[PDB]
Amino acid sequence: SMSVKKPKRDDSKDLALCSMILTEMETHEDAWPFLLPVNLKLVPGYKKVIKKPMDFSTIREKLSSGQYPNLETFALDVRLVFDNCETFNEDDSDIGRAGHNMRKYFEKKWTDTFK
């Protein structure tokens, strides 16, 4: 509260570490559904159904231009990618499996790096 602060957790490396994680996600073989924004002109249903589209290129641009205030807002956008994937794609599809695999991959890197 006012004039009463918990000890300072060192966040000075967070930007570099999120950039490393994102590089790992970008280079994963199963990243292909997530590398670019879904083309809203070409994919029926997407625009109306998925209220907040998100993809790795968009996260990378946000990351590079100071649009994440902290590492939690970065994790929220990454998880949004996989939540959107599960909303739109059957689990037993190539894209649906890709999204489960990538979520697992991310959440391990996230725990190992920060927790």
Swiss-Prot record:
Source organism's superkingdom? Answer: Eukaryota
Using the record's annotation, list all stretches that form the Bromo domain.
9-113
Instruction: Name where it's found.
Output: Nucleus
So which tissues is this one expressed in? Expressed at varying levels in several tissues, whereas a smaller transcript was expressed specifically in testis.
State the function annotated in the UniProt record. Answer: Regulatory subunit of the ATP-dependent BRF-1 and BRF-5 ISWI chromatin remodeling complexes, which form ordered nucleosome arrays on chromatin and facilitate access to DNA during DNA-templated processes such as DNA replication, transcription, and repair. Both complexes regulate the spacing of nucleosomes along the chromatin and have the ability to slide mononucleosomes to the center of a DNA template. The BRF-1 ISWI chromatin remodeling complex has a lower ATP hydrolysis rate than the BRF-5 ISWI chromatin remodeling complex.
Q: How does it assemble?
A: Component of the BRF-1 ISWI chromatin remodeling complex, at least composed of SMARCA1 and BAZ2B, which regulates the spacing of histone octamers on the DNA template to facilitate access to DNA. Within the BRF-1 ISWI chromatin remodeling complex interacts with SMARCA1; the interaction is direct. Component of the BRF-5 ISWI chromatin remodeling complex, at least composed of SMARCA5/SNF2H and BAZ2B, which regulates the spacing of histone octamers on the DNA template to facilitate access to DNA.
User: Per the similarity annotation, which family is this?
Assistant: Belongs to the WAL family.
Q: What is this protein called?
A: Bromodomain adjacent to zinc finger domain protein 2B
Q: Which organism is it from?
A: Homo sapiens
